[PDB]
């Protein structure tokens, strides 16, 4: 956790992570159910799960961003938008965001 | 796809087949791969023209109403 701790050179300095809500913008140009060129931008605050940080720093690495989330957020936006047409993206926007 | 934008199916399909082919070379591949769909100029133009044309049809209906009002004004 946050605070003044200690370490043993035999085990070495622990891995530090940006454990606070950090914004990321995902601008996406995509299609729709009526095949229209939708410009849509998604904005998300990210934290890593603290209890999962050990595991993260094996599979993802010390950088929990740029390796996983670009694919997740970009693909999810396109899969959601493709389930609505150009008009529904606004008139049904509530459901779209859900 | 072109016209068949069934991205749920393309993602499951490429996910399975890429996974099998990755294991062919002792790789682990299990992802959410960003499927892009950029198309040709003529495809894009036809597809946009569809919506442009129907918006123009609605506009023509409004112009007919406008013309009726002008007819009454003139009379």
């Amino acid at each position: 956790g946050e605070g003044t701790h200690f370490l043993i050179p035999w085990v070495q300095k622990p891995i530090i992570f940006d454990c606070r809500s950090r914004p990321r913008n995902v601008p996406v140009i995509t299609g729709s159910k009526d095949l229209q060129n939708v410009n849509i931008t998604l904005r998300i605050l990210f934290r890593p799960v603290a209890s999962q940080l050990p595991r993260i720093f094996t599979s993802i690495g010390e950088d929990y961003d740029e390796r996983v989330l670009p694919s997740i957020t970009t693909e999810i936006l396109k899969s959601v938008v493709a389930r609505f047409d150009a008009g529904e993206l606004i008139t049904q926007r509530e459901l779209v965001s859900r | 796809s072109q016209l068949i934008t069934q991205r749920a199916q393309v993602s499951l399909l490429i996910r399975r087949e890429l996974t099998e082919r990755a294991k062919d070379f002792s790789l682990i591949l299990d992802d959410v791969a960003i499927t892009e769909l950029s198309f040709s100029r003529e495809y894009t133009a036809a597809v946009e023209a569809k919506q442009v044309a129907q918006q123009e049809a609605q506009r023509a209906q409004f112009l007919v109403e406008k013309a009726k009002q002008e007819q009454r004004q003139k009379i």
Side-chain angles (χ1 to χ4, degrees), chain A, chain B residues 3-75:
Chain A
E2 185 176 19
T4 302
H5 311 288
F6 62 94
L7 62 86
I8 300 171
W10 290 106
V11 306
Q12 281 294 302
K13 180 178 179 180
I15 309 300
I16 189 67
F17 305 89
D18 181 344
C19 293
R20 56 186 181 182
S21 297
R22 186 174 51 84
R24 185 179 185 87
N25 293 325
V26 184
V28 167
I29 303 171
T30 186
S32 75
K33 284 194 306 208
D34 63 337
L35 305 173
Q36 299 301 301
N37 290 323
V38 173
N39 306 320
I40 185 166
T41 299
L42 167 68
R43 180 175 174 87
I44 303 172
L45 296 173
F46 290 104
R47 285 181 293 157
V49 177
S51 71
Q52 300 304 300
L53 292 175
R55 180 191 58 77
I56 293 169
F57 176 72
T58 60
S59 172
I60 302 171
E62 68 277 9
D63 186 354
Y64 62 86
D65 205 353
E66 306 295 343
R67 305 169 71 84
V68 176
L69 297 170
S71 66
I72 296 307
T73 58
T74 305
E75 183 55 49
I76 284 169
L77 277 182
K78 291 186 175 182
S79 84
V80 171
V81 171
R83 300 198 288 277
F84 301 91
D85 70 23
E88 290 179 312
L89 289 172
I90 307 177
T91 61
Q92 300 176 11
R93 178 185 176 283
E94 175 67 20
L95 179 59
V96 173
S97 70
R98 299 180 184 189
Chain B
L3 304 165
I4 298 175
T5 51
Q6 297 303 295
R7 301 179 53 89
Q9 298 302 313
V10 81
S11 68
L12 295 172
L13 180 54
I14 69 169
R15 181 171 176 270
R16 178 183 61 78
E17 292 181 341
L18 288 173
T19 296
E20 302 168 355
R21 291 283 291 153
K23 293 178 176 179
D24 284 351
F25 299 89
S26 295
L27 298 175
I28 306 170
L29 184 52
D30 180 357
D31 66 28
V32 186
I34 297 173
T35 300
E36 300 292 301
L37 290 175
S38 181
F39 297 109
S40 69
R41 178 192 57 76
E42 279 296 330
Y43 176 89
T44 300
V47 168
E48 182 176 5
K50 175 179 181 179
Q51 279 299 353
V52 171
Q54 74 92 357
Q55 293 295 331
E56 289 295 321
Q58 296 182 42
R59 182 173 75 88
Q61 297 174 13
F62 287 129
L63 294 173
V64 171
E65 183 66 36
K66 176 182 184 287
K68 287 185 304 175
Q69 299 300 325
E70 297 170 350
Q71 174 186 30
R72 178 56 189 161
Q73 172 191 358
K74 180 175 297 180
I75 292 170

